[PDB]
Amino acid sequence: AMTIWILKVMNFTIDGMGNLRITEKGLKLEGDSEFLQPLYAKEIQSRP
Amino acid sequence: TSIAITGSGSCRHLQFIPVAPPGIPSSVTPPTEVPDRDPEKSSEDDVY
């Protein structure tokens, strides 16, 4: 029951944590991301 | 003693004093085009 609760809370679909994926470099976000609280950053270097 | 009539301005590619120049410039090497494509991925963790 507890593990099914974990699977329902985090939505562990066939391909990872929903649209979110975790790789070697870091988070890869295949969904929108609206945050309720202020975020922080260090740089924002868009790719050429 | 000598006269040297040379082009400039809009005559950059023109020299008008005959010095008998045999200079034949080479050709620019063709650089391989490098388009960058980032399509989405399903998790390779599906394999494991």
Offer a quick outline of the entry:
This is part of a larger assembly, with chains A (48 residues) and B (48 residues). Chain A has one helix at 2-10; strands at residues 12-13, 16-17, 20-22, 27-29.
Largest interface: A-B, 6 and 7 residues
The number of distinct helices of chain B, counting runs of at least 4 residues, comes to 0
The SS-based structural class of chain A is: alpha+beta
Given the helix and strand composition of chain B, which structural class is it?
A: little secondary structure
**Most strands sheet of chain A:** 2 strands, antiparallel
**Oligomerization:** part of a larger assembly
Fraction of residues in β-strands of chain B: under 5%
Global Rg of chain B: 27 Å
Helix content of chain A: 10-25%
Q: Gap between N and C termini of chain B, in Å?
A: 87 Å
**Secondary structure: helix percent of chain B:** under 10%
Rg of chain A is 14 Å
Q: What proportion strand of chain A?
A: 15-25%
Specify the overall morphology of chain B.
Answer: rod-shaped
Task: Describe this entry's structure for a reader.
It is classed as membrane protein. Keywords: beta-helix, sarcolemma, muscular dystrophy, membrane protein. The entry is titled "Cryo-EM structure of native dystrophin-glycoprotein complex (DGC)". This is part of a larger assembly, with chains A (48 residues) and B (48 residues). Chain A has 48 residues and is of the alpha+beta class. In chain A, 19% of the residues lie in helices and 21% in strands. Chain A is built from 1 helix and 4 strands. Chain A has a two-stranded antiparallel ribbon with strand order 1-2. Chain A has a two-stranded antiparallel ribbon with strand order 3-4. In chain A, a hairpin with a 4-residue loop joins β3 (20-22) and β4 (27-29). Chain B contains no helices and no strands. The N and C termini of chain B lie far apart (87 Å). With 48 residues, chain B is largely without helices or strands. At the A-B interface, loops of A face loops of B.
